[PDB]
Structure 1
Amino acid sequence: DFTQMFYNQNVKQFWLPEEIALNGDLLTWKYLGKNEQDTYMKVLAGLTLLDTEQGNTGMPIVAEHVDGHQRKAVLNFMAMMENAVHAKSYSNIFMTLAPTETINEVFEWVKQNKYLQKKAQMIVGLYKAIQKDDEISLFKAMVASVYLESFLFYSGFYYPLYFYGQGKLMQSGEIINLILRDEAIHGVYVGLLAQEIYNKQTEEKKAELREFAIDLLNQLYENELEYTEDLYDQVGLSHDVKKFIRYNANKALMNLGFDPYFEEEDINPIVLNGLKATVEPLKDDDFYF
């Protein structure tokens, strides 16, 4: 009942980072403190890693196991967006704002950062555990994918949105909003596929799947807290970002058909402001008048 409308929405949302000129951010970037620039680079690098794996691994593997040519076409399109559009856009931003050495250093930093490695290990592990014709392993990977789309990106998205909302780094911010617009529909779509599998189960099996989903969310959440503190303490925003990730965790649960898990909190209003002619053959009668 939904794939065709998602197909149409995904293809109509198609974009490339080159559509957005980035040289306009040069001055507002220059004006940020060293702490702010550091957090910003690292935040986008963490996002780049997530999209790299979502494009290389997550979306293609889910596409492989989901039945139906139209469902596969949507998932293939989403996969392309992840690595050919989203992951690449971050390099466009980096290449504009930062010198090569700072770019090299931040990519080295992703490799050695323990929270980023842990979250990649956990998510990709679940993708690679999918067994052919085994719907339960597929469900588990789809939960992981929804958590990546609708929860994990948001510790990263906070900062570009926070600046956009203050009228700073607005070209980079425009790119990020386009990425976010895509991930929102990706999270909903994968959520609907996960619910399909969940709804086939016995009540006992469903109870176990909810346990899996909640245990996984809590494990990812605890890691994300440490990641958030590590990045945002130097810019004074860790508590604010934490509220934002809890907000989005609830959206991820809802995408999976589950009740919200965290209590509602006031999000920084700045971040909320951050959001041919037809050819017809000649007849014989055409030559007489």
Structure 2
Amino acid sequence: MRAVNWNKKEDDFSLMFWKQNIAQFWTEEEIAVSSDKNTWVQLSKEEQIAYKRVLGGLTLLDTKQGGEGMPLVLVHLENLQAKSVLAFMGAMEEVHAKSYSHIFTTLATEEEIDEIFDWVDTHPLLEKKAGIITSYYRRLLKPEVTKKELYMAMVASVFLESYLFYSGFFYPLYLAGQGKLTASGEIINLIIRDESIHGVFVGILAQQIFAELSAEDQQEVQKETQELLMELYEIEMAYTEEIYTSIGLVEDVNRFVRYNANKGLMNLGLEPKFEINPIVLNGLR
């Protein structure tokens, strides 16, 4: 039975990602958010509701990535150095999820917070979206998996990391780009910095597996990947309509979703399928 041996590289990238993950390490106690109250109270009721809802959705996605996506993809890897990186990335998803609770503590009463999480749990689009992704992860709950199954779990993971978060990240970035909720915006920026390298890394692992598949299997997963992309897109467009119609931002968020869907495809070595908002860009500064 093999032990991980870092003195003999298993690939040309795991060590750099290991070091970068650790270089980026942070926790919610580093960013105090109480000063956001002064701009929080300036938001309309509809704006506050949208913000809380998107952060609830982000919390759900990080919960599933740390508790299902990273663990189940990493248990089936043969590359022990890449497994190490994924384990750390999974822990960081739990840091991310806990940081949303830190934001909530400042922006909402205890009763308001539990209402957010009840809304998350009973929400049909969030259930459908998370169910589609986790179906690929739960396919790995068996002793022997195929490379097509592992590849598609990695595709699902890249799509979560590089694409499904972004209908939610839009709004904290959009507000922070205007000087509103900038401390929470700093947290979201730290989260994004992590998700960006998560998506690149899992996409490298996916491309390595893809190269080992037969031509027939390659065709099959290419079709599944394109179909998954567009299945998620239809759900995202329903989600942005539900969240953002009240505040007039639906088409802006949709443009942002498509930009990030293209980045997810590129992380997998695939061509873009869709043809950044300048305020969001200022929030990423």
Residue 116 (structure 2) aligns with: 106
After TM superposition, give the deviation of residue 93 of structure 1 in Å.
0.1
Gapped regions of structure 2 (runs ≥ 5): 1-11
Runs of 4+ in 1 over 6 A off after TM superposition: none
Give the Cα–Cα distance (whole angstroms) in 2 for the partners of residues 56 and 112 of structure 1.
19
Give the Cα–Cα distance (whole angstroms) in 1 for the partners of residues 211 and 78 of structure 2.
17
Identity %: 57
Q: After superposition, what is the alpha-carbon deviation per residue over 1:216-243, rounded to whole angstroms, capped at 9, x for unaligned?
A: 0100110010011000001100000000
After TM superposition, give the deviation of residue 69 of structure 1 in Å.
2.4
Give the Cα–Cα distance (whole angstroms) in 2 for the partners of residues 202 and 127 of structure 1.
22
After TM superposition, give the deviation of residue 259 of structure 1 in Å.
0.3
Amino acid at match of 1:17: E
**Higher Cα Rg: structure 1 or 2?**
1
Q: In angstroms, what is the RMSD of aligned CA positions?
A: 0.9
- Verify the 8 A CA contact 2:161 2:198 in the aligned structure 1: yes
Alignment pair present for 1:193 and 2:205: yes
Give the Cα–Cα distance (whole angstroms) in 2 for the partners of residues 216 and 268 of structure 1.
26
After TM superposition, give the deviation of residue 68 of structure 1 in Å.
2.6
After TM superposition, give the deviation of residue 67 of structure 1 in Å.
1.5
Residue 216 (structure 1) aligns with: 228
Alignment pair present for 1:272 and 2:281: yes
Give the Cα–Cα distance (whole angstroms) in 1 for the partners of residues 109 and 249 of structure 2.
26
Residue 131 (structure 2) aligns with: 121
After TM superposition, give the deviation of residue 273 of structure 1 in Å.
1.0
Give the Cα–Cα distance (whole angstroms) in 2 for the partners of residues 68 and 245 of structure 1.
32
After TM superposition, give the deviation of residue 202 of structure 1 in Å.
2.8
Give the Cα–Cα distance (whole angstroms) in 1 for the partners of residues 139 and 214 of structure 2.
22
Q: Which of 214, 225, 242 is equivalent to 1:230?
A: 242
Give the Cα–Cα distance (whole angstroms) in 2 for the partners of residues 162 and 48 of structure 1.
19
Gapped regions of structure 1 (runs ≥ 5): 276-289
Matches within 5 A, 1:77-226: 77-83=88-94, 85-130=95-140, 131=142, 132-226=144-238
- Verify the 8 A CA contact 2:148 2:213 in the aligned structure 1: no
Give the Cα–Cα distance (whole angstroms) in 1 for the partners of residues 117 and 214 of structure 2.
45
Number of aligned positions between the proteins: 271
Q: Which of 32, 42, 48 is equivalent to 2:43?
A: 32
After TM superposition, give the deviation of residue 133 of structure 1 in Å.
4.2
Give the Cα–Cα distance (whole angstroms) in 1 for the partners of residues 238 and 99 of structure 2.
26
